[PDB]
Design an enzyme around this catalytic site. Structure first.
Site, PDB file in Angstrom:
ATOM      1  N   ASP A   1      -8.592  -0.826  -8.116  1.00 52.99           N
ATOM      2  CA  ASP A   1      -7.941  -1.198  -6.869  1.00 52.99           C
ATOM      3  C   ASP A   1      -7.716  -2.700  -6.799  1.00 52.99           C
ATOM      4  O   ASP A   1      -6.687  -3.171  -6.279  1.00 52.99           O
ATOM      5  CB  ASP A   1      -8.835  -0.705  -5.718  1.00 52.99           C
ATOM      6  CG  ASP A   1      -8.150  -0.546  -4.418  1.00 52.99           C
ATOM      7  OD1 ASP A   1      -6.908  -0.475  -4.349  1.00 52.99           O
ATOM      8  OD2 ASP A   1      -8.916  -0.483  -3.432  1.00 52.99           O
TER       9      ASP A   1
ATOM     10  N   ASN B   1      -4.959  -6.164  -9.805  1.00 46.91           N
ATOM     11  CA  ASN B   1      -3.679  -6.862  -9.957  1.00 46.91           C
ATOM     12  C   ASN B   1      -3.811  -8.238 -10.595  1.00 46.91           C
ATOM     13  O   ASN B   1      -2.981  -8.569 -11.472  1.00 46.91           O
ATOM     14  CB  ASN B   1      -2.960  -7.022  -8.612  1.00 46.91           C
ATOM     15  CG  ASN B   1      -2.626  -5.704  -7.948  1.00 46.91           C
ATOM     16  OD1 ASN B   1      -2.547  -4.636  -8.579  1.00 46.91           O
ATOM     17  ND2 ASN B   1      -2.347  -5.787  -6.681  1.00 46.91           N
TER      18      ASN B   1
ATOM     19  N   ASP C   1      -5.161   5.652  -1.074  1.00 53.47           N
ATOM     20  CA  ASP C   1      -4.517   4.914   0.011  1.00 53.47           C
ATOM     21  C   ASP C   1      -3.439   5.747   0.714  1.00 53.47           C
ATOM     22  O   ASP C   1      -2.554   5.190   1.357  1.00 53.47           O
ATOM     23  CB  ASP C   1      -3.915   3.587  -0.512  1.00 53.47           C
ATOM     24  CG  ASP C   1      -4.870   2.423  -0.490  1.00 53.47           C
ATOM     25  OD1 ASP C   1      -5.836   2.459   0.346  1.00 53.47           O
ATOM     26  OD2 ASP C   1      -4.539   1.503  -1.298  1.00 53.47           O
TER      27      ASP C   1
ATOM     28  N   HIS D   1       0.819  -1.213   0.000  1.00 52.61           N
ATOM     29  CA  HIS D   1       0.000   0.000   0.000  1.00 52.61           C
ATOM     30  C   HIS D   1       0.856   1.267   0.000  1.00 52.61           C
ATOM     31  O   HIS D   1       0.866   2.053   0.946  1.00 52.61           O
ATOM     32  CB  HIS D   1      -0.932  -0.001   1.197  1.00 52.61           C
ATOM     33  CG  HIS D   1      -2.082  -0.933   1.011  1.00 52.61           C
ATOM     34  ND1 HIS D   1      -2.165  -2.164   1.628  1.00 52.61           N
ATOM     35  CD2 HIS D   1      -3.178  -0.824   0.219  1.00 52.61           C
ATOM     36  CE1 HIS D   1      -3.279  -2.768   1.225  1.00 52.61           C
ATOM     37  NE2 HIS D   1      -3.906  -1.973   0.373  1.00 52.61           N
TER      38      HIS D   1
ATOM     39  N   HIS E   1       1.497   1.335  -5.760  1.00 51.21           N
ATOM     40  CA  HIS E   1       0.087   0.940  -5.819  1.00 51.21           C
ATOM     41  C   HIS E   1      -0.789   2.111  -6.253  1.00 51.21           C
ATOM     42  O   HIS E   1      -1.678   1.959  -7.105  1.00 51.21           O
ATOM     43  CB  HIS E   1      -0.386   0.389  -4.443  1.00 51.21           C
ATOM     44  CG  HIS E   1      -1.866   0.119  -4.323  1.00 51.21           C
ATOM     45  ND1 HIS E   1      -2.540  -0.814  -5.095  1.00 51.21           N
ATOM     46  CD2 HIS E   1      -2.781   0.647  -3.490  1.00 51.21           C
ATOM     47  CE1 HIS E   1      -3.812  -0.832  -4.756  1.00 51.21           C
ATOM     48  NE2 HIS E   1      -3.977   0.019  -3.762  1.00 51.21           N
TER      49      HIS E   1
ATOM     50  N   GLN F   1      -4.691 -17.311  -3.717  1.00 49.51           N
ATOM     51  CA  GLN F   1      -4.966 -16.518  -4.910  1.00 49.51           C
ATOM     52  C   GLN F   1      -6.151 -17.084  -5.678  1.00 49.51           C
ATOM     53  O   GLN F   1      -6.979 -16.327  -6.184  1.00 49.51           O
ATOM     54  CB  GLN F   1      -3.735 -16.434  -5.807  1.00 49.51           C
ATOM     55  CG  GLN F   1      -2.623 -15.595  -5.208  1.00 49.51           C
ATOM     56  CD  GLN F   1      -3.139 -14.257  -4.761  1.00 49.51           C
ATOM     57  OE1 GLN F   1      -3.656 -13.481  -5.565  1.00 49.51           O
ATOM     58  NE2 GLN F   1      -3.023 -13.970  -3.464  1.00 49.51           N
TER      59      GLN F   1
ATOM     60  N   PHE G   1      -9.165 -15.869  -3.708  1.00 47.81           N
ATOM     61  CA  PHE G   1      -9.317 -14.433  -3.919  1.00 47.81           C
ATOM     62  C   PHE G   1      -9.925 -14.144  -5.286  1.00 47.81           C
ATOM     63  O   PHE G   1     -10.884 -13.377  -5.390  1.00 47.81           O
ATOM     64  CB  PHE G   1      -7.940 -13.774  -3.758  1.00 47.81           C
ATOM     65  CG  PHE G   1      -7.903 -12.287  -3.967  1.00 47.81           C
ATOM     66  CD1 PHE G   1      -8.776 -11.439  -3.316  1.00 47.81           C
ATOM     67  CD2 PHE G   1      -6.898 -11.733  -4.738  1.00 47.81           C
ATOM     68  CE1 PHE G   1      -8.696 -10.052  -3.490  1.00 47.81           C
ATOM     69  CE2 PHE G   1      -6.793 -10.357  -4.911  1.00 47.81           C
ATOM     70  CZ  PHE G   1      -7.698  -9.510  -4.287  1.00 47.81           C
TER      71      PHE G   1
HETATM   72  C1  JN0 Z   1     -10.228 -11.940   1.491  1.00 44.48           C
HETATM   73  C2  JN0 Z   1     -10.072 -10.896   2.558  1.00 44.48           C
HETATM   74  C3  JN0 Z   1     -10.206 -11.404   3.964  1.00 44.48           C
HETATM   75  C4  JN0 Z   1      -9.842  -9.621   2.280  1.00 44.48           C
HETATM   76  C5  JN0 Z   1      -9.823  -8.975   0.924  1.00 44.48           C
HETATM   77  C6  JN0 Z   1      -8.656  -8.044   0.693  1.00 44.48           C
HETATM   78  C7  JN0 Z   1      -7.769  -8.265  -0.351  1.00 44.48           C
HETATM   79  C8  JN0 Z   1      -6.705  -7.401  -0.613  1.00 44.48           C
HETATM   80  C9  JN0 Z   1      -5.765  -7.684  -1.729  1.00 44.48           C
HETATM   81  C10 JN0 Z   1      -5.357  -6.720  -2.571  1.00 44.48           C
HETATM   82  O1  JN0 Z   1      -4.500  -6.869  -3.610  1.00 44.48           O
HETATM   83  C11 JN0 Z   1      -3.955  -8.109  -3.830  1.00 44.48           C
HETATM   84  C12 JN0 Z   1      -3.073  -8.218  -4.893  1.00 44.48           C
HETATM   85  C13 JN0 Z   1      -2.495  -9.461  -5.132  1.00 44.48           C
HETATM   86  O2  JN0 Z   1      -1.616  -9.619  -6.155  1.00 44.48           O
HETATM   87  C14 JN0 Z   1      -2.824 -10.574  -4.340  1.00 44.48           C
HETATM   88  C15 JN0 Z   1      -3.706 -10.432  -3.291  1.00 44.48           C
HETATM   89  O3  JN0 Z   1      -4.021 -11.489  -2.508  1.00 44.48           O
HETATM   90  C16 JN0 Z   1      -4.304  -9.181  -3.007  1.00 44.48           C
HETATM   91  C17 JN0 Z   1      -5.230  -9.025  -1.903  1.00 44.48           C
HETATM   92  O4  JN0 Z   1      -5.540  -9.978  -1.159  1.00 44.48           O
HETATM   93  C18 JN0 Z   1      -6.495  -6.319   0.246  1.00 44.48           C
HETATM   94  C19 JN0 Z   1      -7.362  -6.086   1.296  1.00 44.48           C
HETATM   95  O5  JN0 Z   1      -7.193  -5.021   2.134  1.00 44.48           O
HETATM   96  C20 JN0 Z   1      -8.438  -6.944   1.520  1.00 44.48           C
HETATM   97  O6  JN0 Z   1      -9.267  -6.680   2.559  1.00 44.48           O
HETATM   98 MG    MG Z   2      -7.557   1.212   0.548  1.00 43.67          MG
HETATM   99 ZN    ZN Z   3      -5.813   0.416  -2.678  1.00 44.82          ZN
END
Ligand code: JN0
Ligand code: MG
Ligand code: ZN
Ligand code: JN0
Ligand code: MG
Ligand code: ZN
Lengths: 323, 316
Positions: free
Chosen positions: A231, A234, A114, A73, A77, A282, A285
């Site tokens: 946001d 990625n 951010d 962050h 970013h 991943q 996510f």
């Molecule tokens: C699933 C939960 C509990 C929260 C969601 C959550 C996810 C992110 C996040 C952002 O950018 C990424 C980039 C990548 O390349 C890989 C990644 O994993 C991520 C992330 O995870 C940031 C959070 O602040 C957040 O709350």
């Molecule tokens: Mg933010």
């Molecule tokens: Zn952000």
């Protein structure tokens, strides 16, 4: 080196810009040079009578207030989210939909969204009884802070890039920027996506084929989701970019988890370096957050975002294949 | 003097408490003495193992952060809203429906709900680009600040009255207090009243889910905040004199800044009496009629409001 920087900035309209290289080539000023380039590309200095020295002074102060010791962050970013929003704003399905002021709001919101992030989540700040969470009553703690800093820095010497907007323009821009950055709070994601899906299911298009948005609620909803997609963009980038972003967020997450573990707290999801599966995390996510959002955005602007969605789906397949 | 104060506090359970008299006999400590009386009345010090010295230390510090040079939004308003919520909580129709922690939250929220109020409105703070509005992004600016101050003061020496609550109890209380104080923002009034109406139309005689119970608590403290026109007329007229002083000072600042003057704030074009009839007809009576329907116990309060509206109309 300046020549190579300028060549790389020629890619500013492209998904997959070499943003990490630009960060190096610019002397860790990716946010400043990418914002400056985008403002020139969109003729925003002329449109809003922004003095160039004021723009550069503000951007360098804003960039200074990102933490260079936070792995994800940080100013890179911010630059990435700015440039991703800039590309999404150019999509054919949105041609001539948004005013210059709304374009300025979305890009400025991305740049500040951010700022001064400490590298730990809202829940961490709430559960540790932080000064930030005390200030903001546990409600969009970080996001309120990012807004307050981003706006307060406009009052520094030769930093008011909005000095020549009318009073009505300043008031409208301030409201839209607030509405956009507050929507980047991940605790709002499910409700934001639900509303975006409702819009896709009922969407109207004009005679020119572009999206029809005839009230503030619909206009700001699209800008909110646009910056939220940026946001969360990625995993939609070429894999070498996506993997660098993942390396960074895992560093930041594991450091938060180390603080949680030391304090005797339950470790947040994806933050336990001893019980981590980065690959499975991943795929999850993408499956549960990023692809539902981006497939809905792609539906809103169909077929404009098909290549972005294809990249996301390829990256999900690649990560899954390592399991 | 201390003996007269003790006898006035015997009416702590009645609508129409002589709170201005109590402010005078207290040495301008109505919030501290009324909160202490209500806490002792409800046994809250023994129940939550609140050291009495800690309660007093916190209360005095909280009261000190209300502005003595603000005519309405000061420690006497805070004390009045505390006592009004305390009476509304003991409504027979709400008997034993809230836990001791929720009672603590409603009363604590009332005590802090305007702390450090500068005597100007949210819209004033927004339109003057104040530090407060910059901090809070133009959204419930004052109410967020009242909460932040009220909670921060718990961290002063010997001020943590919640020190013996369990960690979960503190988390729950904090959430409810935030939900309640944020609901005192007057820009949320219409939406808050709409939901109270929906609840009355579906009322069971009994609130099963937290959503409905916090909604009643939000509306209860909002009624208490807007309870001056339902009090005995001599009290209501004093409250009206005070808020008109505060409003007219704000309108003087808006005029001088070249701003639109807020409703009721232009001393050169004011009709205090017409304003009160409008305030009751359009805000206070619709709210209190809905509340009285919820607790159908509030009849004497609604009667007083209607009596006071009739009187103000007769002064036109
Ligand atoms: C699933 C939960 C509990 C929260 C969601 C959550 C996810 C992110 C996040 C952002 O950018 C990424 C980039 C990548 O390349 C890989 C990644 O994993 C991520 C992330 O995870 C940031 C959070 O602040 C957040 O709350
Ligand atoms: Mg933010
Ligand atoms: Zn952000
Ligand atoms: C109509 C507009 C613009 C705002 C409504 C509004 C009204 C009050 C208010 C409170 O307690 C009173 C007590 C009295 O005895 C007499 C009174 O008149 C009032 C009031 O008016 C406080 C606000 O913060 C607020 O927003
Ligand atoms: Mg208030
Ligand atoms: Zn109040």
């Amino acid at each position: 080196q300046e020549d190579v920087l300028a060549k790389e900035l020629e890619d500013v309209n492209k998904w997959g810009l070499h943003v990490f290289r630009i960060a190096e080539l610019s002397g860790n000023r990716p946010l400043t040079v990418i914002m400056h380039t985008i403002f020139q590309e969109r003729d925003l200095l002329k449109t809003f009578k922004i003095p160039v020295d004021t723009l550069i002074t503000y951007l360098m102060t804003l960039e200074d207030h990102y933490h260079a010791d936070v792995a994800y962050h940080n100013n890179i970013h911010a630059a990435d989210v700015v440039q991703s929003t800039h590309v999404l704003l150019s999509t054919p399905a949105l041609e001539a939909v948004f005013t210059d002021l709304e374009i300025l709001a979305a890009i400025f919101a991305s740049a500040i969204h951010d700022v001064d992030h400490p590298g730990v989540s809202n829940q961490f700040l709430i559960n540790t009884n932080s000064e930030l969470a005390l200030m903001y009553n546990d409600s969009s703690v970080l996001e309120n802070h990012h807004l307050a800093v981003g706006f307060k820095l406009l009052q520094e010497e030769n930093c008011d890039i909005f000095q020549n907007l009318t009073k009505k323009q300043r008031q409208s821009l301030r409201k839209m920027v607030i509405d956009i950055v507050l929507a980047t709070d991940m605790s709002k994601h499910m409700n934001l996506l639900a509303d975006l899906k409702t819009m896709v299911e009922t969407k109207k298009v004009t005679s020119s084929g572009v999206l029809l948005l005839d009230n503030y609620s619909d206009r700001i909803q699209v800008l909110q989701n646009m910056v939220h997609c940026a946001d969360l963009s990625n995993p939609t980038k070429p894999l070498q970019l996506y993997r660098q972003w993942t390396d960074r967020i895992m560093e930041e997450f594991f450091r938060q988890g180390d603080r949680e573990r030391e304090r005797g707290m339950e470790i947040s999801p994806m933050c336990d370096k001893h019980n981590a599966s980065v690959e499975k995390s991943q795929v999850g996510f993408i499956d549960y957050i990023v692809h539902p959002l981006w497939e809905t955005w792609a539906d809103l602007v169909h077929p404009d975002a098909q290549d972005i969605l294809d990249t996301l789906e390829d990256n999900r397949e690649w990560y899954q294949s390592t399991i």
